[PDB]
Amino acid sequence: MLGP
Amino acid sequence: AGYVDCTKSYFEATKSLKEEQLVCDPKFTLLDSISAFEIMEPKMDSGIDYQPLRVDFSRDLSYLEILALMDLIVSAEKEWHYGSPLSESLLCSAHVFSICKSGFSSGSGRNTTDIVLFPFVLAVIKCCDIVHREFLMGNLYDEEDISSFSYHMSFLQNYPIEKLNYLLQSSIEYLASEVIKFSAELRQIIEGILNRIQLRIGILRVYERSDIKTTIDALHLIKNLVPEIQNTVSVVDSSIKESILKQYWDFRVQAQLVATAPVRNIPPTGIEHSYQRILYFADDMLLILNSHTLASSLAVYQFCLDFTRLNRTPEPYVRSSLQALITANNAVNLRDQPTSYMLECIREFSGLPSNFYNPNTRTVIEKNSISSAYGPLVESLIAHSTNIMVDLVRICSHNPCRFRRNLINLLPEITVAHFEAEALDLKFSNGPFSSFIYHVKLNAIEHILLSSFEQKLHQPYQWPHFFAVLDHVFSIHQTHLELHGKDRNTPPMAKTFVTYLHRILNAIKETYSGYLLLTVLCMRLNIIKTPSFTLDEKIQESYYMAHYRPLINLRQPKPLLRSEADCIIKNLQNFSTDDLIIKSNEKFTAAKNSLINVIKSGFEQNEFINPYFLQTNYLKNLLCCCITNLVSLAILSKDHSANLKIVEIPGNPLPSLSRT
Amino acid sequence: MVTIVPYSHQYLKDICQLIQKDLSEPYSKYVYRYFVHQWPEFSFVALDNDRFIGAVICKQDVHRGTTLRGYIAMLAIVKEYRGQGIATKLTQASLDVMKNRGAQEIVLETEVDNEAAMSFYERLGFCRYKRLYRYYLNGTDAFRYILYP
Amino acid sequence: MGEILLTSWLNRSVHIEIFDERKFIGKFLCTDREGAAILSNTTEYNKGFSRALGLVVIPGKHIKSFSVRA
């Protein structure tokens, strides 16, 4: 998952 | 806006494009368009079928939809303090949203909601203004910590606190004239309202300080009212709290406010836990208010290294208000002439000569021998090491995940300030200057390693490299203090401060060097599973370059290499299984007897240790981690196949071999 | 048979339908296009026969000064095809492209409570490098994994 | 042609209405083959109020109008  | 209509001309000019080409600006640069919303799917936008509730205030509330709203609003603003944005936590309440946009009703006849509930809502909004401009003071991080965006709202900046103190005192003189004329289980609910008003009148006296005695007498009032509130919270059963969550609560209020990010669906905690957070707020605001009795400049340096050793990470308002209370101290001079805070830490720890530093004015004498002959070195060391001690004070108001990587970024600056300190100390790793900056360098390494363990990023088949590195920097720091407390140039007031600091480190080292003997014991009894992929040499060369990456690049202290740390474990793995038990039963016995000899010893008649250093509950938390870890080494000494396990109790620094 | 396919442009509309339903992070359509219009030889797609069972999405830039860093951006499999051995010959096929082109570190961020894909990455050699306090927009923390090949 | 016509619109304000009468007004930036009109400084214009979103995507299975002059 790519965080914000 | 849009005037000329071209829809048919648009849906036949895009369907003539290629497979995956874009008609964009030459300076559009697709990295820019990765924070954009995609409006029509959920979790991106929030305006799908809103219907904004039609609040209709013109209705009298009984004394149970007032008490349930008083608990829903407190539980709403106490979870804005811990994360979640102001929209969809607190602005979703339809009474706060009506003011941040006399009484509530237009036909003002002052019913029992304008007398009672309306001064309560005014105080929650006024409390969320004093807190909000503490959030904008620049001591935290804008998204990891609080989301402090105020969605173009106004938290009554032009409402006087004298009018708010008279509306709110009038609500107590109204409720106390009606306890006597109601029954025996309504009367119970009105006296539960009267504590929630006097908890809000007491929380408000903490936010505006205005003194130091009335903000401790108010923090002793919060700790007494919350146990009397938390037991009468179970009066609103299930269907009063449902018929006001659809009548006076609009959960989707983000659909009419300015969007800065997608909807952070942070899970709530409830009303019973949100009153515990007020007990958590009042318990460590009492700890920070004890930083007015710090009567030295070395105690200020250590109050901030014990503050990051807490096992709860208190609150973003409590953390960010430490910076405002530790500068205004009137015993050390921070925030104006802050280079007298660095020189006072060195005059105490190792002692400066009387022709170099004048302690009655806390500054370097203007024309002396050292500061005029070797000019641009003295003015360079003092400027370089002031920007470390002042920087270390800015780091204590941080979450422990960014307290650590702000200490890692500070290690290339202590390495410079230590190199031009032991070059000045030849003109007077010992001496006045370089023996304190080496102590700050070694306390920074011990806080990088210990917080890398409490962040649970050393998965348990990597303990024996961690516990071998950790007692190698404990061993260097221990033979540095007792070499400095054995000097003759050090002042005798801080000769008994070093040997009190050295007995604390000897109790911490003896309880962490007892875990190297316990991990090797548990790794051969298969309590700690060592998996098949870790025995690759190209993998364990990356395990060591990822954890102990800042410590390898240093040349002082000497780094423990991987091929050297593997010879400590191999010299300890060739013991017997019944001999590793009796060797680890004596290392925790020596750690138990040395930990109780510190927490019951005096250690406070000295001026500058840290008088509040046992209130972080660190030295007694790893005292229980070597007692309950000792009642299972007796079980393991009887049978080597006992079914023990390694538990991860969340209020403890260290895991313990606990179960049966 | 389960094969690994080097991502032609036809599988983009299935990547958005899969990753949106099991990854708790709100990506738009122009987030996938940022990784696959510039680095398309690092992303791979696994098919059952023609069926699109999961995919991986990667990139490889120079990070700050000279460290060429690969970055596993997102990885997921359909729920009916987990546990078999897909997404370990799908992500190893992506770890081989960014190793022959000479990366010096390979990072990725995963969730803290997500255990099924953090005991999976340790099996490939990744270890925890940082902890990110409240990284994602749920208030949940994140670990940053790293591998030095 | 499609690309030269879309390049003339590429910085003027548009008036996308999606399907349930939510009219977005913002600066046009980018599309694709399906219609994925990236808007900047976007305003919501819901039932009776307006938000201040800033950057949106608006896929083209949910586009009812593309009025653009100013």
Ligand SMILES: O=P(O)(O)O[C@H]1[C@@H](OP(=O)(O)O)[C@@H](OP(=O)(O)O)[C@@H](OP(=O)(O)O)[C@@H](OP(=O)(O)O)[C@H]1OP(=O)(O)O
């Ligand atoms: O992106 P930011 O939050 O601004 O943080 C970045 C960066 O982060 P990215 O990872 O997102 O690129 C690095 O991160 P890593 O690859 O190391 O994760 C970096 O690391 P270095 O210090 O090794 O350069 C350093 O983070 P930190 O400050 O946490 O050490 C840095 O932050 P700054 O640019 O703020 O220094």
